[PDB]
Nucleic acid binder design. Structure first.
Ligand SMILES: [K+]
Ligand SMILES: [K+]
Ligand SMILES: [K+]
Ligand SMILES: [K+]
Ligand SMILES: [K+]
Ligand SMILES: [K+]
Ligand SMILES: [Mg+2]
Ligand SMILES: [Mg+2]
Ligand SMILES: [Mg+2]
Ligand SMILES: [Mg+2]
Ligand SMILES: [Mg+2]
Ligand SMILES: [Mg+2]
Ligand SMILES: [Mg+2]
Ligand SMILES: [Mg+2]
Ligand SMILES: [Mg+2]
Ligand SMILES: [Mg+2]
Ligand SMILES: [Mg+2]
Ligand SMILES: [Mg+2]
Ligand SMILES: [Mg+2]
Ligand SMILES: [Mg+2]
Ligand SMILES: [Mg+2]
Ligand SMILES: [Mg+2]
Ligand SMILES: [Mg+2]
Ligand SMILES: [Mg+2]
Ligand SMILES: [Mg+2]
Lengths: 121, 306, 173, 113
RNA sequence: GAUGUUGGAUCACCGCUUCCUGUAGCUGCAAACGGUUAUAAGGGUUAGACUGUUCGUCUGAUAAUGCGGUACGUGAUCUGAGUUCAAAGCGUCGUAAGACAGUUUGGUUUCUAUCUUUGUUAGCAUAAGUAUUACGGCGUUGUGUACAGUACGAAAGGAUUGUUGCACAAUUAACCAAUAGUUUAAAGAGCAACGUUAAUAAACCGGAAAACUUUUAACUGCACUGUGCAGUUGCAGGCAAAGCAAUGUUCAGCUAAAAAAA
RNA sequence: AUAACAACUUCUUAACUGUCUCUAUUCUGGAUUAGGCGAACUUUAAAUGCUUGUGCAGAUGCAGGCUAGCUAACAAGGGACGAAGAGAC
RNA sequence: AAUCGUACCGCAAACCAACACAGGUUAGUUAUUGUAAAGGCUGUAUAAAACCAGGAUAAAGGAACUCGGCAAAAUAGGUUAUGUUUUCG
């Protein structure tokens, strides 16, 4: 449950460190969570691939708000993080230091499921 | 209330006898019909009777797929046919059902008189259900039990909601209010404007204002019947039911279901004939996969790549 | 019966803050033990009846832990000594209901309701209370029912020292 | 409620664990074609409320940080629970400080199976 | 012998000269995307940077971000940034007192509701219950995706149709088993949404009343400013080894009971 | 031009937060219920509905179309060109 | 060695404010490490509306509020190697 204009930490190796949400896509409501794609602005980057002041797409991977499952259980993280994506829908890096959850078992996240180190499933 | 009574006058002697003869002729009725309890075919336009139940509370269970299901428990103490209506006397056909039990010295003589006259217990609540044909009438005294319903169907529930007292616009109608700071003065939770100026010059009817909230009749449609316990007269329904514990709830076959669905269920008609004691506890089976979205793309995704 | 509210414990607010509320009820409870009959307003009487019953329960306990709790409630040493010695023996067999409340109309000035709170077994009692242990007829359905449900039903008052304690003392001496 | 609790006890037999114990929990992931995994973590909260009982499991990873799960105790997805160790704490305030500051909670780095 | 100014906050009723969601023709209409005319006002009409603003420029999304009337709606409901008192500075004009119709900083926002209008509730007035029909209120929403790379088309591009299927959003109606927040004379309490369930309709809700039925024509009360679906083996008090508004129970209060024998 | 100084006006950074997305629960006092005590603004006369038309040109009171149990309590503030001060412009 | 003051109130219900008025009113003395000797004073009867005032707590986000960070919150305190500006303090 992240409202618009929230700050996120980048967990890929593309070079970006800090981003801010500036928009949503479709009709998600007043807040977004894990598995949704948003529009972000880069605030702090140290690299050649990306620079501060650019606008990119990203996917939410971790959040501190409870994530509910059909069986009645839920889990929480201790940080909010995202992964930058290209216009074709592929990550801008090749190594993700994050814990992948059940949301990414879906077919559309095959690339993320390959470059991630630790997986909960 | 009622309007003041209208004046009455004696009839002239040349007309009084004629009026009385005609009024008596219209008020003369034939013998009461005697319904017979027998299975009947179900037709495209044929409504069944409902039942009167008591709300017990909420619980939860896990289904065959391991999913948590919230449930509301309804208890049917004793529901019986306590009267009939027919065209000759009332102009339409209906069945009257009563439920509950009260002591004789706690009700008015008018209420107790009807039940004593037919050798029936004094019942706390009474409600009417309209039928389509005279053959749909049930004999007086027939019991309506939990076996009246088929597990897995959809039902409608009606009742009175929980009383909340005198409440403001923010809680009663969800008004936004006014800012907590920036110079606001004693108007944080007030409704604000209620009209304009000289035109139109008045406040419209049903304008939303503070008042009492919480004791009103509400209906929920399309709830699922999860489990049935004919022996103990229990119904387990998924979802929320209006009213607090002990509220009186009316249960009916949902109008959202089509004729084909009713035929497939093979609902009892006019009602279940037999002894419900020797019946097992049944749970509905759902031929659906709640985890299909993890194998196939069926979910909502607004972005088109490339 | 005494109404139950939504605050912690379900007690009355007595139109006072919690700190002043506790100071008042402790003082009145001390006076009830000393005099055994008090006339006051209905709200203070209802709260005192329920609070008074729980203070007698501590006295019946006769333990070090119970005395510590009671020592923070009673205001006078003489009243605390009476509670553990005299009232403890008086209500050995009575299971609850050690205090009664009877309404007595309205006052003169502010027309407030009033009532009388009293102990239920003593000389000077307003009425005669039922025996602490109810006698059971020898040929009644009640006697058979109690045997089937509670074989340890008590039908007559028990002595201060039960036979097991008496037998031990006799064997020792 | 008691009727359902009796049936559950006939099907499963779990130990009487407390807060502060390290547990190994075997669970089935319905999302991943009902595959079995084993999780190890610390028990930080336990609620005894009959059929609605639940507990919280805490663990820390090498780089991703802390991770918390809330698990109903009577959920059929859970297959087994075992006690493997104990972590000392002084009071709730001390336990909360430990959770916020991830350290010395990396029993197993990943999930088994 | 006084009809409170601009813009906004809050909450509204109406018109159609229709921005989107509809229906039917024409086209310089292959498909897709369009153009134009007739008809249609049920629902919807976005979050931010600059500016006191209306307006205007721009950014990310959106099915789309329409116009107008209502004292250019709305201060006995709120706001006071601009404008429009007394202080002061600068520029220009006047010998001066001073002026600006230029600019800059600062500068008090009252009212206990008698009548009418409106939301709720009680008492009184023709006994109570069930109540067809009539009357009044409410308004049946939107996006993506699958059926299909199929019809059409050289290629590229790329559909129509549905009482369609599925997922989601807003609105409305409730709900408290679970999850999150909240009270120390504490808690498996109560109330709550950040949580759960349901709806896309001749469905749903309100009051009067024909007829019918019953009665010796009915009429307070459980501490009662939460609820009584609790009226005498009745009870949210007390007491117990008990899940603590539940189970058990000999005590408290309201309201004490019986012919003998055969 | 200028170091220091400023409850002066302007813009920015760090942190913080119910200012806000979006509110919820709760304590104390008032309101609200009961007994006692006991004011004030105001008042031509009143038994004081809606709508369109009319008119010293924006009608509770005039004309047409409608409106039928009775008196109040608690609550809101559209109208009575509402009250206060013989308009300051 | 005569003469005048000596009662009572005096941070206040007795003095100045039309009042038993949340305002105004001079000097001298007293207990107290984290506390505090003497002395002095004291509130009609209840509670589980809306709304208003003064407090407390709050998931995820953290100025997106607004004319304006108004109000509220916030490790706020001390010692520093080095650097900058000075009218050299
Ligand atoms: K209306
Ligand atoms: K329910
Ligand atoms: K006790
Ligand atoms: K249109
Ligand atoms: K200054
Ligand atoms: K008014
Ligand atoms: Mg608000
Ligand atoms: Mg003011
Ligand atoms: Mg305020
Ligand atoms: Mg038109
Ligand atoms: Mg307008
Ligand atoms: Mg205007
Ligand atoms: Mg106004
Ligand atoms: Mg001047
Ligand atoms: Mg000058
Ligand atoms: Mg000059
Ligand atoms: Mg100032
Ligand atoms: Mg509840
Ligand atoms: Mg009790
Ligand atoms: Mg009061
Ligand atoms: Mg007119
Ligand atoms: Mg008129
Ligand atoms: Mg004049
Ligand atoms: Mg917070
Ligand atoms: Mg802003």
């Amino acid at each position: 449950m992240l409202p618009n204009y929230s700050f996120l930490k980048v967990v890929d190796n593309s070079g970006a460190k800090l981003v801010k949400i500036i928009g949503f896509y479709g009709h998600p409501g007043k807040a977004v969570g894990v598995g949704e794609v948003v529009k972000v602005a880069i605030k702090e980057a140290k690299g050649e691939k990306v620079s501060a002041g650019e606008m990119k797409k990203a996917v939410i991977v971790e959040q501190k708000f409870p994530v509910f499952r059909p069986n009645g259980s839920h889990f929480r993280h201790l940080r909010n993080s995202c992964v930058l994506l290209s216009e074709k829908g592929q990550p801008l890096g090749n190594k993700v230091r994050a814990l992948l959850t059940y949301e990414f078992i879906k077919p559309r996240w095959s690339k993320l499921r390959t470059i991630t180190t630790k997986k909960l499933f | 209330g009622y309007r003041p009574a209208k004046p009455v006058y004696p009839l002239p002697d040349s007309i009084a006898s004629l009026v009385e003869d005609k009024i008596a002729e219209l008020k003369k009725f034939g013998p009461t019909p005697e319904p017979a309890l027998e299975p009947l075919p179900l037709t495209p336009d044929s409504v069944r009777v409902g039942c009167i139940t008591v709300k017990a509370g909420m619980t939860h269970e896990w289904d065959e797929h391991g999913v948590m299901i919230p449930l509301t428990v309804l208890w049917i103490d004793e529901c019986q046919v306590v009267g009939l209506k027919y065209f000759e006397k009332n102009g339409y056909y209906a069945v009257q059902l009563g439920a509950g039990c009260v002591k004789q010295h706690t009700v008015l003589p008018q209420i107790a008189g009807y039940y004593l006259k037919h050798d029936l217990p004094i019942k706390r609540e009474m409600k009417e259900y309209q039928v389509s044909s005279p053959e749909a009438l049930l004999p007086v005294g027939t019991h309506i039990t939990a076996a009246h319903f088929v597990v897995g169907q959809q039902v409608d529930v009606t009742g009175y909601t929980t009383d909340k007292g005198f409440q403001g616009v923010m809680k009663r109608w969800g008004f936004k209010g006014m800012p907590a700071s920036h110079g606001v003065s004693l108007s944080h939770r007030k409704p604000g404007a209620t009209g304009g100026r000289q035109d139109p010059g008045k406040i419209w009817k049903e304008k939303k204002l503070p008042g009492h909230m919480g004791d009103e009749k509400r209906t929920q449609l399309g709830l699922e019947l999860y489990k049935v316990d004919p022996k103990r007269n229990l119904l387990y329904v998924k979802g929320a039911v209006p009213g607090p514990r002990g509220a009186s709830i009316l249960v009916r076959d949902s109008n959202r279901m089509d004729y084909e669905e009713r035929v497939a269920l093979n609902l009892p008609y006019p009602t279940f004939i037999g002894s419900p004691d020797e019946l097992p506890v049944l749970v509905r089976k759902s031929d659906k996969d709640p985890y299909l979205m993890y194998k196939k793309e069926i979910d909502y995704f607004p972005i088109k790549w490339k | 019966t005494v109404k139950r509210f939504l605050r912690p414990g379900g007690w009355n607010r007595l139109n006072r803050p919690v700190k002043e509320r506790l100071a008042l009820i402790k003082n009145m409870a001390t006076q009830l033990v000393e005099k055994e009959r008090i006339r006051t307003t209905l709200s203070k009487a209802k709260n005192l009846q329920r609070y008074g019953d729980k203070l007698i329960t501590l006295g019946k306990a006769g333990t070090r832990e119970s005395w510590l709790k009671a020592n923070d409630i009673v205001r006078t040493d003489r009243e605390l000594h009476k509670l553990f010695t005299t009232l403890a023996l008086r209500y050995k067999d009575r299971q609850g209901g050690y205090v009664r409340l009877i309404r007595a109309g309205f006052r003169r000035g502010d027309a407030a309701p009033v009532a009388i709170v009293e102990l239920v077994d003593r000389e000077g009692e307003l009425r005669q209370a039922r025996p602490a242990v109810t006698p059971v007829p020898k040929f009644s359905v009640m006697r058979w029912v109690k045997q089937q449900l509670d074989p340890k039903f008590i039908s007559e008052p028990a002595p201060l020292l039960p036979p097991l304690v008496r037998d031990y003392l006799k064997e020792q001496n | 409620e008691t009727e359902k609790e009796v049936e559950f006890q006939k099907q499963r037999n779990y130990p009487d664990f407390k807060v502060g114990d390290v547990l190994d929990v075997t669970m089935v992931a319905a999302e991943n074609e009902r595959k079995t995994y084993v999780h190890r973590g610390l028990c930080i909260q336990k609620r005894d409320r009959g059929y609605g009982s639940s507990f919280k499991l805490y663990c820390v990873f090498s780089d991703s940080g802390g991770f918390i799960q809330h698990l109903p105790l009577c959920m059929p997805d859970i297959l087994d629970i075992k006690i493997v160790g104990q972590v000392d704490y002084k009071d709730e305030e001390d336990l909360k400080e430990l959770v916020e500051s991830e350290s010395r909670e990396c029993k197993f780095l990943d999930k088994v199976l």
